[PDB]
């Protein structure tokens with residue numbers, strides 16, 4: 236009784252899955268509130284915690300990190316859900332606490348950890364209204380090192396004529412991901428701005444929750460892991476590809492939805508991006 240969430244089908248991942256491309260050996264770091272490693276539908280390979288109060292990265296006191304991890308790599312088996320890249324080595328980088336909040340030094344420390352342990356893909360379903368020199372330096376350093384960095388655009392909606400995309404998604408080096416529903420329409424809470432790159436399903440997204448549960452969440456945080464998992468599926472087919480050609484492939488083969496200020500280049504199509 237394994238259910239494939241609409242989001243995985245929408246981005247066309249199951250087409251790569253049937254060819255033998257499931258993201259094997261690609262290392263994906265889920266910089267978030269930790270991942271519940273005791274979940275029978277998740278296989279966490281490693282990680283580290285930078286939350287001074289929550290030293291176990293494999294204990295998710297919020298539920299956010301486990302949900303995001305499931306969209307990325309919920310195992311292909313007989314139970315629960317199926318991720319975008321079922322065979323990726325999942326890394327729990329806990330930078331957010333039980334309350335869902337985290338300080339920048341902790342997040343930046345986690346980004347540094349991912350660079351030094353050679354994460355092929357960094358996923359940041361988090362953000363804030365302000366950036367620092369150090370947050371820009373960490374994300375640019377990861378990209379200069381060959382890491383594909385993906386982050387949620389934010390859940391700020393519209394604000395007149397300006398950008399509501401948060402950081403680190405706002406930085407030119409990070410792929411900013413917005414949210415669409417099942418019918419390909421922008422979700423009202425999705426952040427907008429010239430920084431938006433791609434869209435992925437982020438409305439009523441079913442994924443793994445701590446304590447052998449499954450539940451649906453809505454937000455750009457749920458959109459981001461579809462792209463991070465799509466980058467892993469593309470790297471499993473094309474391991475020689477640099478982070479730049481992966482991002483270039485993902486942005487240039489999207490399905491066009493309205494204006495770029497609201498939809499970026501459009502909905503990702505991992506089947507077309509993987510060639």
Ligand SMILES: [Ca+2]
Pocket residue numbers: 237276309310311312313314315316317
């Ligand atoms: Ca499963």
Ligand SMILES: [Ca+2]
Pocket residue numbers: 403404405406407408409410411430
């Ligand atoms: Ca960006």
